[PDB]
Each structure stands twice: as C-alpha cells, then as structure tokens.
Design a protein around this ligand. Structure first.
Ligand SMILES: CN(C)C[C@H](O)COc1ccc(Nc2ncc3[nH]c(=O)c(=O)n(-c4ccc5c(c4)CCC5)c3n2)cc1
Length: 271
C-alpha cells in the first residue's frame, strides 16, 4: 500500500509467534504475514549493519528466486531496529541438524543435501552473485528436510570488524582458499572452495573443519598445500568431488555447473 515500495513490508502485517534465537545481527523470530504466511523476522541490532547499503542490495536479492535459496520477502526500514523478512525454515540451521545423531542419516540423504546447496550455488553463479560466506551455519532446513542456502552476500554489510577481515577474530578462515587468506582475493572460486568445506561438514555430521587446529594453524596448513581429509561417510567418489574444490590454483577448481554434474553422477552410481 501507500508508503511501501516493492521491497518494503509493513511491520503492522506481522504477527510474532516464537523466538528462534539470536544471530550476529540480533534476535530472529518466527511469525505470520497477513495472518496466513509463515515468515522469519531478523531484527537488526542498531550499529550492526550497513543499513542503507543493505537496503539497496535487498532490491537485487529479492529477484534471486530459486527453490534452494531462502527467499528474501522484504524489509521493514521505517524505524529501528529494521527487520529483514525471509522464508521460514522449520528445521533450523543445517549445522545443528547434522549434529543431531538421532537422524541416523543414510549417505544418500547427505549427498542430497550437497545437491540442494550445489543447485542454489549454480543459480547464484549463473547470476554472477557471490555468496561470500558459504558454510553449513548459513544453510537452513525446511519441514521436508530440503536444505537451502541463506544470507547470500550479507557479510558485505557487517560492521563488526572481527568478522570482515583476516585481521579480525571471527573471519571464516576454515572456509577460505589460500588466495583469500594471503591476498583477500574473493571470486567464484572462493565460493567453490567453501562449498568443498561444506560438503566436508555434511559428510562429517557437522564437525568443525580442522577441529584440532586454531585458525592461525589452519591458515599455515592450507598455505603448505595440505588439506582436510576424507570423512568416514564419504565414498571415494564423494571425496574426489570435495577435494576438487581445493586445488591450490583457483582456475583449476570446477564451476558449480561441473560440481552439480559430478554430484548427479554419483547419485546415479550410488543409488
Ligand atoms: C529447538 N532447538 C533445538 C533449535 C533452536 O530453537 C533453533 O531453532 C531454529 C532456528 C532457525 C529456524 N528457522 C529459520 N528460518 C528462516 C531464517 N531466516 C533468517 O534470516 C535467519 O536468520 N534465520 C536464523 C538462522 C540461524 C539462527 C536463527 C535464525 C536463530 C539462531 C540461529 C532463520 N531461521 C528454525 C528453528
């Protein structure tokens, strides 16, 4: 209605039902939009986000529509804290889901999770849109057990310097290729590297990558040309796929289209 652009949701249309938890921008709630539609509501803590830049980017993000991407529905930006309204994913973050041993996952279920994420990433790659912080903690799981990629590009708007540089103390060192750690060279191939690490997280049922090392030690390890090794649940063919994401030379790493093809081939050979 009047006073709201196509990217803008009227907060008066929201019914708040449950608190999901706190993320790095603050509290996230579950609710309904116009009494019927499930939504998640990020409530953005004052001083945590580059809000004007995010709002301009939200316009681009809302047009990134793919079944395996958590949809941005709109933003509430007339008052602080601002809200980001997203698709609701009932089974929570992927990292926590993997760590719940009750699920007793078959490897075919783990490969399907990888395929979900790979499809999202092939879509973003086709739109020349980098995720910039791909990891299991940034994927969500719906009530059907479908995995979707969330928070694509959002690291660009984080004002906490601990997150936004290697000199910072919350930077995703363990998901980063050597050229990011050495030179801050972000590209499609840094997303590819991260996706390999995410496959490793899935097949390890949510272990921390390089779990016995510090971030500094991890940086040195990968700079010496050394890598993660094979999760017990990963077949030889699955391991080859994740390992292909870690070529020292970025231009030798596959595309998301190639990875998707490889993952489908393994699904065919292993089901
Ligand atoms: C019961 N117990 C064991 C699980 C906890 O109760 C956590 O349950 C949860 C968490 C998230 C969801 N679903 C959802 N759906 C769309 C989201 N969109 C966002 O932008 C967004 O930022 N989060 C989110 C992402 C990560 C985290 C939170 C929110 C809260 C802390 C971690 C979204 N979480 C469901 C259930």
């Amino acid at each position: 209605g009047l006073g709201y652009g196509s990217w803008e949701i009227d907060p008066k249309d929201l019914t708040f039902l449950k608190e999901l938890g706190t993320g790095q921008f603050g509290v996230v709630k579950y609710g309904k939009w116009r009494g019927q539609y499930d939504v998640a509501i990020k409530m953005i803590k004052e001083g945590s986000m580059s809000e004007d830049e995010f709002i301009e980017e939200a316009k681009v993000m809302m047009n990134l529509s793919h079944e395996k991407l958590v949809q941005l529905y709109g933003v509430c930006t007339k008052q602080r804290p601002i809200f980001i309204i997203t698709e609701y994913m009932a089974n929570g973050c992927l990292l926590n889901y993997l760590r719940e041993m009750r699920h007793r996952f078959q490897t075919q279920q783990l490969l399907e999770m990888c395929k979900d994420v790979c499809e999202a990433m092939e879509y973003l790659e086709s739109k020349q849109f980098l995720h910039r912080d791909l990891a299991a903690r940034n994927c969500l799981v719906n009530d059907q057990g479908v995995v979707k990629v969330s928070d694509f590009g959002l690291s660009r708007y984080v004002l906490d310097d601990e997150y936004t540089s290697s000199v910072g103390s919350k930077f995703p060192v363990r998901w980063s290729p050597p050229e990011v750690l050495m030179y801050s060279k972000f590209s499609s191939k840094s997303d590819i590297w991260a996706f390999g690490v995410l496959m490793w997280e899935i097949y390890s049922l949510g272990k921390m990558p390089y779990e016995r090392f510090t971030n500094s030690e991890t940086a040195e390890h990968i700079a010496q040309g050394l890598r993660l090794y094979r999760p017990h649940l990963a077949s030889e063919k699955v391991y080859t796929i994740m390992y292909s994401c870690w070529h020292e030379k970025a231009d030798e790493r596959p595309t998301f289209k190639i990875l998707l093809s490889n993952i489908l081939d393994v699904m065919d050979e292993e089901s």
